[PDB]
Amino acid sequence: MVLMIVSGRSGSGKSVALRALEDMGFYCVDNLPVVLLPDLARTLADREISAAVSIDVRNMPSPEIFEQAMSNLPDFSPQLLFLDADRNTLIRRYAIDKESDLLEPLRSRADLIVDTSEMSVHELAEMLRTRLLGKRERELTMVFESFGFKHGIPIDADYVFDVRFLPNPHWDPKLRPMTGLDKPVAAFLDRHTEVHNFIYQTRSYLELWLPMLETNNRSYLTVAIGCTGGKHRSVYIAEQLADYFRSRGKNVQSRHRTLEK
Amino acid sequence: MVLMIVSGRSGSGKSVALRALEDMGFYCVDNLPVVLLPDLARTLADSAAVSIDVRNMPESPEIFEQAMSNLPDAFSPQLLFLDADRNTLIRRYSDTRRLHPLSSKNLSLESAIDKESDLLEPLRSRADLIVDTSEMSVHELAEMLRTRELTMVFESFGFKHGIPIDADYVFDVRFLPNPHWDPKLRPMTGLDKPVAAFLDRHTEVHNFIYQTRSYLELWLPMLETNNRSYLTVAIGCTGGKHRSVYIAEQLADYFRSRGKNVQSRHRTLEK
Amino acid sequence: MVLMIVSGRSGSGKSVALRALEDMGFYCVDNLPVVLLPDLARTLADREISAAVSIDVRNMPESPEIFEQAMSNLPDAFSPQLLFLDADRNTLIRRYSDTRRLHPLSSKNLSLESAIDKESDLLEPLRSRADLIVDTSEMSVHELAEMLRTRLLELTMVFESFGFKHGIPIDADYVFDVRFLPNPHWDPKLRPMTGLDKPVAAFLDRHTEVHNFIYQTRSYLELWLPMLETNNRSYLTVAIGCTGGKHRSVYIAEQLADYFRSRGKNVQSRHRTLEK
Amino acid sequence: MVLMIVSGRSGSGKSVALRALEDMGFYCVDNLPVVLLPDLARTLADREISAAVSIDVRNMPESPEIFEQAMSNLPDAFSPQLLFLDADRNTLIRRYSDTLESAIDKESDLLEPLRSRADLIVDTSEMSVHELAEMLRTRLLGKRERELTMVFESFGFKHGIPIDADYVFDVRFLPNPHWDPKLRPMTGLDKPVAAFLDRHTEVHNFIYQTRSYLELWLPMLETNNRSYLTVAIGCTGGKHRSVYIAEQLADYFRSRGKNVQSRHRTLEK
């Protein structure tokens, strides 16, 4: 039923908002010409799925075409979000006076507006899931936590997954002082087909049971990833699994026992 | 006037192609449905770049054929199909989003990427170009495309007169059997049948023609796609009257028979 | 004592293995002719050391009878063990130095492609009898070495059942929560029995969704079981747990256990709640 | 007919010398027990092929009588020659920590039987890997003064083909490392630009198929009285792809024992 029309200054993060919608299951068309907007909708109404378009400084038509084109919308209920963005922040993400004026028709009719000035990629993403799903507190909350077996299995765990067989980044003495949050330890593991495959099959196995765990009256679901030391492999896989479900819209929380000291 | 259809398995770099085509000046619309392709085309007549992906491929080619049929007269379609190794795609995946957010879940990442080549077989089997992005970084795939028919020229020269400035390749044949052994041939050239009958009756000349045409055929495809109108292959002996004249015309007739667009020149006989 | 035979295509890291085997303590002889292998072996016996030879494209005798005949005469107090490293065709190509004949001792080859392929054909006798095989394709210099230090220093699977109110068993490697499956406490007749007692078993067996959990778990375990087998791990512990540890977990644990018995594995079952 | 015995203190570069002997065609056995020396030789005598062994501190017997008894037992058809490398204390440490002083000092005692019989002795102290390799061919193949000389030079097509070229190969179609702005100030002698070109399978295959094409004709080009052979590789700028491929081709023929010389026209400005 919902048609999300994303707009905003170039550099504010409209593409990020658009990708986050896709991960939930929206069907998104980027930089579609304004005039064809209704044309798209009728063909997707019969499809029965939620849509998201982007109107960008390269795509805005005379403000009369925008009012005219949005008026011909059939079926589906709309909503227009655009973000504002600091000049120095917009430049850093990538004249400006011509680009601020052109978007004024869109700037004036937007149902929601978001200041993305201080937000990172992950931080803009999660803010937007929150404003289109609601900080739902009465949903199950998934905790993904990384631990080291030599320090003991966390008492609160519901599931425990052993990752000790995957490629060990302590083998490279350059990486030995870093953690799984640090970009080189990550790249070590990404070059291994089996690290990807373990992440994928694990979240797949959880999603098999997530409907039956979400609905029975459970407040938490605790998933513990563990290696020998809790510094490298498990820290990576846990944040990885954790950020996976975040994109699915779920209520997720990550915590790394060995690193929180 | 050109309609750029970017395609490929997820992980192959089509997201890079659109950003590059846009930096080039195309109008880029991502994930426009197939049926509406001409309607976008009709509105632009008064060059565009779209992407056909697993998320919009209609899974029955008749939807693709019908949609391409209604394309306006002012626009010409050209289909780009970036691809990469199965395991390379798996590594490129950033683990935190559905590979196919809009269709049912798969057995494996292996199976996920494999069903995607099966589904994309029509776009790939009509693909004007295919780019194996398997070895490429972010920048270099970009630049390969910004850097985006051949005529081969075989010309014979004499070393005492200097190497032709337009040469790309230079092959020295001064060591092959010298036809100056028969004084009858000494005033003739390699275009005259007797000098040819000498050089042909020596097995070792065929071997050089053979190994040289083989070494060229190794790189001929990669020279064809990169923006070269001409490829100049210069054969040279000492005077430029005998052995080079013959061999150069020989290489020419080979690639002629392979159908190539070939053209010959003899620098020593044209003065 | 061990006679370690390193093999593999050119570019695969056999040279790395020998540097790794040396840091570990082998007496390493590179390119020794096959025929002299027993002669090397007997001469190391009275000194009581394990030695490492490399059989490569430069010494593989093309006639497998020469390798078997030589393997037959090896002394008694030595046990032969064959390692064979390989890599992707093109990865070998990127590894090559460009500046040294690939096969400096025999006929030149059409193609780098045809060279590396000719090499796999010549080494199939060694590859087909290879005790372990290592695809070094994704590995750096250090990690091929360190991988070898790690398993130079057979598995029994334990499936055990517990109750969450009593705490997770300390020896668990994997813990799977089953508290969401059909609860057999619906039948108060079952309430004093355990998951080993036949009526409870017929309960859980009657629900299609219990088989699905049993099936989907052992299949998820099968994904990693090969790598846990080669990883120098003596035991693998899979703990199934419900709230009480009497019914659902006791059954499911015994199920997974009997499954891997049928694939032939080394399994042993345990129930922490029934052992008190 | 030759049996080359490479030795020296650990860190002297004997592994390098051993490999360089292989690239030319010796049959090399590393770390063979000293006692087995004659057994190896008897098996290679029929094979009609020239061999090289290495005697190292990990392999030299503690009593020099076993080494001398063993070397006496060498068969007729092999002629032994013993090469011995030595180097400065600080230099040995440096090559080693890329592979106790009371240990190297106590270990110096072991090698004296070999050192005092050394037919050639080579100071590898100030030498790089390429330099030790090039020196050792010189002391084994002579100064190849009357042999043909191969000249490999890289140029840029925008500056014109060098006049002395005998063969000219165009590589402008290969992955251009100017695509990575990081490489733009470098040359093909700089390690990253090489690493760029190495990840490409066709950069390897081009170097190989070119050196293969040249070796097809080299028997006839060496023999007829020709003093020089000049092979020019050219890309547009003569800074990256050609500079790399040219030196690669050159170091290949260097390892073959040939008389080689490299020159890069655009970089020698």
PDB file of C-alpha atoms in Angstrom, chain B residues 135 137 139-140 143-144 147 159 163-165 167-172 174-175 207-208 211-212 215 218-219 222-223 228, chain D residues 157 161-163 165-170 172-173 179 181 184 196 199-202 205-206 209-210 213 216-217 220-221:
ATOM      1  CA  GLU B 135      40.532  -9.748 -11.466  1.00  0.00           C
ATOM      2  CA  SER B 137      39.512  -3.573  -8.495  1.00  0.00           C
ATOM      3  CA  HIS B 139      38.841   1.842  -9.989  1.00  0.00           C
ATOM      4  CA  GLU B 140      40.015  -0.363 -12.794  1.00  0.00           C
ATOM      5  CA  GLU B 143      38.468   3.101 -16.039  1.00  0.00           C
ATOM      6  CA  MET B 144      38.211   0.151 -18.455  1.00  0.00           C
ATOM      7  CA  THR B 147      38.438   3.883 -22.008  1.00  0.00           C
ATOM      8  CA  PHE B 159      66.311  -2.160 -41.780  1.00  0.00           C
ATOM      9  CA  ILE B 163      61.560   1.271 -38.838  1.00  0.00           C
ATOM     10  CA  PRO B 164      58.140   2.584 -40.000  1.00  0.00           C
ATOM     11  CA  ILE B 165      56.929   5.088 -37.447  1.00  0.00           C
ATOM     12  CA  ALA B 167      54.476   0.224 -36.341  1.00  0.00           C
ATOM     13  CA  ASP B 168      53.059  -1.488 -33.240  1.00  0.00           C
ATOM     14  CA  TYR B 169      54.856  -4.783 -33.743  1.00  0.00           C
ATOM     15  CA  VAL B 170      58.197  -5.364 -35.498  1.00  0.00           C
ATOM     16  CA  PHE B 171      59.421  -8.854 -36.505  1.00  0.00           C
ATOM     17  CA  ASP B 172      62.983  -9.435 -37.826  1.00  0.00           C
ATOM     18  CA  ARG B 174      66.881 -11.459 -41.528  1.00  0.00           C
ATOM     19  CA  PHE B 175      67.754 -14.995 -40.320  1.00  0.00           C
ATOM     20  CA  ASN B 207      57.358 -22.529 -39.378  1.00  0.00           C
ATOM     21  CA  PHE B 208      58.086 -18.829 -38.844  1.00  0.00           C
ATOM     22  CA  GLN B 211      54.498 -19.416 -35.124  1.00  0.00           C
ATOM     23  CA  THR B 212      54.115 -15.691 -35.808  1.00  0.00           C
ATOM     24  CA  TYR B 215      51.574 -15.430 -31.381  1.00  0.00           C
ATOM     25  CA  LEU B 218      46.850 -14.784 -28.815  1.00  0.00           C
ATOM     26  CA  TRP B 219      46.395 -11.042 -28.360  1.00  0.00           C
ATOM     27  CA  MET B 222      42.169  -8.044 -26.574  1.00  0.00           C
ATOM     28  CA  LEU B 223      43.313  -5.557 -29.186  1.00  0.00           C
ATOM     29  CA  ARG B 228      42.254   0.823 -31.877  1.00  0.00           C
TER      30      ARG B 228
ATOM     31  CA  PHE D 157      55.131   5.073 -28.254  1.00  0.00           C
ATOM     32  CA  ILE D 161      60.417   3.455 -31.514  1.00  0.00           C
ATOM     33  CA  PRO D 162      64.134   3.241 -30.642  1.00  0.00           C
ATOM     34  CA  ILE D 163      66.197   3.117 -33.823  1.00  0.00           C
ATOM     35  CA  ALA D 165      65.285  -2.207 -32.241  1.00  0.00           C
ATOM     36  CA  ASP D 166      65.279  -5.606 -33.871  1.00  0.00           C
ATOM     37  CA  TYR D 167      61.906  -6.737 -32.448  1.00  0.00           C
ATOM     38  CA  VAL D 168      59.113  -4.429 -31.167  1.00  0.00           C
ATOM     39  CA  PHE D 169      56.253  -5.767 -28.973  1.00  0.00           C
ATOM     40  CA  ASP D 170      53.155  -3.629 -28.180  1.00  0.00           C
ATOM     41  CA  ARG D 172      49.303  -1.166 -24.626  1.00  0.00           C
ATOM     42  CA  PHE D 173      46.345  -3.564 -24.420  1.00  0.00           C
ATOM     43  CA  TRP D 179      43.860   3.323 -13.509  1.00  0.00           C
ATOM     44  CA  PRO D 181      45.781   6.858  -9.011  1.00  0.00           C
ATOM     45  CA  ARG D 184      50.482   7.213 -11.219  1.00  0.00           C
ATOM     46  CA  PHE D 196      49.182  -4.481  -9.950  1.00  0.00           C
ATOM     47  CA  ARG D 199      47.211 -10.104 -10.326  1.00  0.00           C
ATOM     48  CA  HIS D 200      46.382 -10.287 -14.044  1.00  0.00           C
ATOM     49  CA  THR D 201      46.646 -13.723 -15.623  1.00  0.00           C
ATOM     50  CA  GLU D 202      47.352 -12.275 -19.107  1.00  0.00           C
ATOM     51  CA  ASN D 205      50.832 -15.208 -20.075  1.00  0.00           C
ATOM     52  CA  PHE D 206      52.211 -12.332 -22.230  1.00  0.00           C
ATOM     53  CA  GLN D 209      54.468 -16.387 -24.647  1.00  0.00           C
ATOM     54  CA  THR D 210      56.865 -13.597 -25.681  1.00  0.00           C
ATOM     55  CA  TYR D 213      58.520 -16.874 -29.134  1.00  0.00           C
ATOM     56  CA  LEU D 216      62.121 -20.357 -30.871  1.00  0.00           C
ATOM     57  CA  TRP D 217      64.545 -18.357 -33.059  1.00  0.00           C
ATOM     58  CA  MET D 220      69.508 -19.391 -35.384  1.00  0.00           C
ATOM     59  CA  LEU D 221      69.959 -15.821 -34.115  1.00  0.00           C
TER      60      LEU D 221
END
